[PDB]
Amino acid sequence: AVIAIHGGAGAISRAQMSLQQELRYIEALSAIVETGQKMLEAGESALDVVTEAVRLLEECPLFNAGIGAVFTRDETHELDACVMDGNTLKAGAVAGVSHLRNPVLAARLVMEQSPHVMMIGEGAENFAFARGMERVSPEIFS
Amino acid sequence: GKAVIAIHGGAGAISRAQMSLQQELRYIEALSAIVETGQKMLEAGESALDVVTEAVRLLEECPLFNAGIGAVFTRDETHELDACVMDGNTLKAGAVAGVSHLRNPVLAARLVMEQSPHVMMIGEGAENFAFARGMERVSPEIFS
Amino acid sequence: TVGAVALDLDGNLAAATSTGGMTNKLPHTVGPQPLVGAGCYANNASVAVSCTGTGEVFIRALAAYDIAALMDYGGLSLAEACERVVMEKLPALGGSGGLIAIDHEGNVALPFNTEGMYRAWGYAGDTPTTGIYRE
Amino acid sequence: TVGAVALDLDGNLAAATSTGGMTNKLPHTVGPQPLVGAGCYANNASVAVSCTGGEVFIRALAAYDIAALMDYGGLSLAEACERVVMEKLPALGGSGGLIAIDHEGNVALPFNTEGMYRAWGYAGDTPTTGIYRE
Ligand code: NA
Ligand code: NA
């Protein structure tokens, strides 16, 4: 039973980076992979573990997801998420959402309670709100 | 080896019992006119991209078929069209999804492939992109 | 959904697909037709594919790339790849539909697992074949 | 972009990805993260993959390409990840990485960028964490 997580791949320079900044990334990745291990060891589904890991990576402002999401050319937030269950081969995805704190949670909901694989913006948002997911202002991602 | 085109106009529950020979020949006539335009173009030495683009453009323009004109309705009595095109030579692709104000999505899809670093555009973004490159805005009522 | 695949004189493959989706579909939903590898794939090294069918299944199956990968990596024929995807993998996941495919050698296939598929094909300078029903 | 793949005790594989897209993204552009088999793929019989990088990542189907290289090409996880990330993507002018777990519990975290914020560990074992190469 095993978990891997990532928080983006790109041009990171040791120059223009202090050890203390680097530790906040190391601490963060480290806390999320532990939460995942603990859950796996407890016998939680590989789906539940990947969902909560990505939810945590979203909530963490250091990563480009949920809080700490980058801005568009038009100074907005458009979040995408996907999840796939290797067991049932079902998949769920949302693209271009602004009003959902945790897109990965909306992606799971699409996988589980929808014939559709992929939903977009207001479609995805309204779908999610109709099943009790809370509406948020995109301010929370900044 | 030998230059060739295949086309399809959808797959599903097509009953002999719900059709007269003459109804059927409408589809055969339509199918055979499009495949022929494609054959002629290939025989004339035209790219596989231009040929598949014109073929799907004509399949869209044909109301017998669920693309562009003759497209089915959404739950809200509107029309949402998707199209994609891919060039096996450049491995470049273009797609539009959930567009309603474009006569011919395959033409918008090629436009995304060719004048855009993006592969896929959705709704207004796709349409704004298309309108800004001289492609005409239409009422979705034309598809009905 | 409607599609076209083509091999030109210069050995190039291309694919295209367009649809209005499943009737009565929820707005702001995406089928497989606009997704590289689901509705549509073309590679000069392998095959040009345009699929039509139940959307979820064709997305989760990557029907159109899976033909290419079975050929390019598994060494399958176009016809063995098509039999595998359309007659075996899709029905197993609940997907009814079919696709059109041309490989780099100019083999053509028009597999489907549905009662019918509006289809047509033919070589340059030759006459077309057209179909609706099975056989 | 962020990601998680996991193999549970029952042998189930799952993958997940979430992103805000490219900094300064043209609105209403779809990257590879929401696209099944580009940003994301899971199969119990093969592998779970979560990629980050997305024009090339859409057209390349990096996530399902791992599964197909293994399932049909007979490559190992490590051979497949080496091929997609360190040969095919760089060749196509596409920069990023992925995390992958196969059904046997092999783990891989390839990337062709200066860095990738990453972490992994078996259950009950202590985690490994990384930023730069090695
Ligand atoms: Na975050
Ligand atoms: Na039509």
Numbering used by the authors:
A (entry chain CCC): 4 to 145
B (entry chain AAA): 2 to 145
C (entry chain BBB): 179 to 313
D (entry chain DDD): 179 to 231, 233 to 313
Lines from the paper:
l-Asparaginases hydrolyze l-asparagine to l-aspartic acid and ammonia. The prototypic class 2 enzyme is EcAIII from E. coli. EcAIII belongs to the Ntn-hydrolases, which are expressed as immature polypeptides that dimerize and then autocatalytically cleave themselves into α (∼20 kDa) and β (∼15 kDa) subunits to form the mature (αβ)2 heterotetramer (a dimer of two αβ heterodimers). The same Thr179 acts as the nucleophile in the autoproteolytic maturation and in l-asparagine hydrolysis.
Variant RDM1-3, in addition to the R207T substitution, also carries a G206H mutation. Thr207 is hydrogen-bonded to the carbonyl O atom of Pro204, and this interaction stabilizes the entire 200–208 loop. Two other substitutions, D210P and S211Q, located closer to the nucleophilic Thr179, do not affect the conformation of the neighboring residues. Waters w3 and w4 are absent in variants with bulky side chains at position 211, such as Gln (RDM1-3) or Trp (RDM1-18). Asp210 and Ser211 could be substituted individually (variant RDM1-37, D210S mutation only) or simultaneously (variants RDM1-3, RDM1-8, RDM1-12, RDM1-18, RDM1-24, RDM1-29 and RDM1-38) without any loss of autocatalytic activity.
